């Protein structure tokens with residue numbers, strides 16, 4: 061049973077308050093923290109902020125902390141349920157909140173506890189956390205993912221004008237996870253100098269996820285820079301490109317504006333079909349193997365058309381919000397073929413696991429993901445191994461809210477010793 | 493005693509390899525990592541790098557890892573010493589390396605084991621790490637430091653022309669540590685908008701330490717932005733400013749280059765005296781209360797002149813290198829009145845604790861410090877509280893290699909409860925509370 065739960069307000073990687081939960085059992089202390097998105101989809105579970113304009117610019121999480129401390133904490137303790145009983149414990153919390161979108165407590169309140177529970181569970185099972193998650197998911201194998209490194213950072217929040225949010229490199233050709241980290245870091249440092257040589261030093265600072273926002277419009281130019289860095293580093297045969305367009309961020313009146321980061325202008329807008337044709341060119345002309353959120357979260361027609369006309373990975377993020385209800389719709393409509401897995405878009409371990417399973421049962425890939433506001437928490441490193449999904453995105457190899465996950469994945473790899481396999485070229489369907 | 497040690501390569505916050513050590517006892521697994529500087533003084537202990545150009549562009553730390561695994565580890569198991577014996581264990585490594593600057597095994601090998609020992613020692617005592625540290629250093633009455641947030645990045649930490657390295661905010665008038673994190677974070681958010689308004693959204697990406705890296709040259713303009721953000725956030729009476737010039741970084745044939753990242757042009761070089769006058773202008777025009785490495789690491793008379801002609805805190809970093817020999821010279825010559833405390837400039841916990849005590853015995857301040865390149869490790873949070881120094885600089889409130897420390901400082905404050913005392917206006921001198 062749970063002995064004590066105690067939440068507090070810590071700061072995330074952008075300097076904003078977020079929830080952290082300590083849970084005590086007879087096995088000791090287990091700590092977890094909650095991430096927070098910037099480009100958040102409209103269908104994500106509620107992130108409860110205080111909105112006290114005078115305190116932390118309305119971003120405090122004092123209310124979510126109080127729901128855990130004053131409400132969740134004593135209920136869960138009183139149940140006497142064991143921390144191994146993840147599903148029981150998550151469900152009690154959902155019922156206590158009584159709202160579909162977790163708007164009574166906040167998804168941030170529920171998730172902090174869910175995460176701390178899962179870590180306690182592991183200990184009570186005397187297993188490492190990735191093995192506990194594996195068993196929670198019914199997996200009897202494990203695999204290290206190909207990491208996807210967001211090296212050219214962009215979007216609605218972008219220290220810059222580029223419309224599409226993320227330009228990632230994936231070392232599919234690497235020998236192991238630790239080698240994938242080498243290839244990513246080397247290409248990162250090479251890209252820094254390509255940017256400096258072309259754009260000057262001013263352009264070598266970093267964005268929220270640790271990548272660069274050189275000052276460019278054309279998304280093709282971001283791909284060209286990434287392609288150059290990969291080649292200058294000597295890894296053309298081994299590294300390919302994934303994108304996150306985050307198209308819901310520049311959806312305007314039924315169309316799409318490839319410059320929305322400038323002062324408004326209805327005249328620069330294009331149709332979904334024009335957007336689709338641009339992506340076909342990117343896939344022909346660059347080693348682009350995955351595109352995430354190519355259209356808006358509500359533009360179902362565009363998704364299903366695009367996905368049927370390509371062979372690449374198409375990742376739902378804002379479309380799917382790690383939510384089994386939306387995933388079902390996406391499966392029926394053949395909208396996408398990969399799920400982005402964000403524990404905080406849904407708000408419990410149990411539901412994210414259910415979402416992963418649903419995608420997988422249906423022939424989808426799954427890419428585990430950070431949020432752009434992260435913490436020192438490294439849960440998602442054990443989750444991606446435990447769920448055997450083969451791919452994770454959790455930042456450039458820069459800023460340690462990113463590296464803490466990458467370094468944990470290297471530890472899990474070393475830990476598996478001989479037993480370690482690396483997804484490599486089968487990142488889309490590692491189950492082989 | 494030590495059951496097993498195992499070291500590995502991990503990546504630091506700039507994506508460079510660094511040393512991590514796992515150390516096992518009957519209590520369990522204790523883990524620490526080693527940070528890495530960019531603007532590194534010539535007198536720092538040796539950071540051993542592999543130099544293999546077909547691996548991490550020369551920056552691997554496989555050699556230090558192997559030193560730890562194959563040679564340091566059996567030495568310490570063999571010793572049979574309890575992990576509570578920080579000093580004995582450190583001394584065994586210092587003697588086994590047997591060089592002045594730790595150039596056989598690397599300061600990074602030694603320090604990675606030193607920190608894991610100290611974590612394990614705290615567990616063996618059944619104490620929190622800050623308390624264990626306290627006992628090692630002979631303190632009892634712990635204090636929470638004022639944090640020094642480096643909210644605009646320049647020098648070798650940023651893509652910009654701005655030559656001086658660090659522009660910091662200190663919430664001396666905060667009510668608690670948790671309150672100082674709120675002040676710091678509000679000024680930092682406010683500053684984002686002052687910068688975006690004047691210079692563009694493209695000016696608000698960040699440097700290595702999480703501060704904004706706007707495309708400015710004039711150091712006075714960095715101060716002006718910070719002062720504006722302070723006033724706009726409503727905290728003028730409660731937050732003051734600190735700098736790390738990192739002058740060794742721009743010292744050129746006996747002069748100083750405030751546009752050092754621009755193609756070399758010696759016509760633009762200025763003298764020590766001219767730099768010192770600038771600092772006087774900054775002191776009179778802005779609430780600057782601390783200035784770090786105002787002169788080159790070997791420019792002793794400039795330091796001594798300047799220090800004698802100001803009433804503020806003057807911090808040795810590259811001057812002193814957390815090294816008792818250099819600190820002693822600094823004391824005799826009145827070169828500065830504060831020590832920047834960096835575990836990896838000297839290479840062991842024991843030496844860092846001795847350096848601190850030396851400084852505090854001589855009436856100096858001590859400011860505990862991260863490096864440019866940090867990790868998820870949080871040791872320096874427990875260290876600054878255990879050493880009761882009253883002041884820490886460990887980044888802007890941005891990038892979690894910085895927040896991990898600040899967050900840990902909040903948890904320690906929580907742990908101490910009504911036993912928690914914040915240094916506040918006594919940051920230079922908190923023994924008085």
Ligand SMILES: O=C(O)[C@@H](CO)OP(=O)(O)O
Pocket residue numbers: 528529530531532701736738809832861862863864865
């Ligand atoms: O000069 C310094 O004080 C440090 C700390 O910010 O920077 P670096 O670690 O690069 O020396």
Ligand SMILES: [Mg+2]
Pocket residue numbers: 097098099100101306
């Ligand atoms: Mg998003």
Ligand SMILES: [Mg+2]
Pocket residue numbers: 304306352353377378400
């Ligand atoms: Mg996305």
Ligand SMILES: [Mg+2]
Pocket residue numbers: 529530531532533738810
């Ligand atoms: Mg330096």
Ligand SMILES: [Mg+2]
Pocket residue numbers: 736738784785809810832
């Ligand atoms: Mg310095």
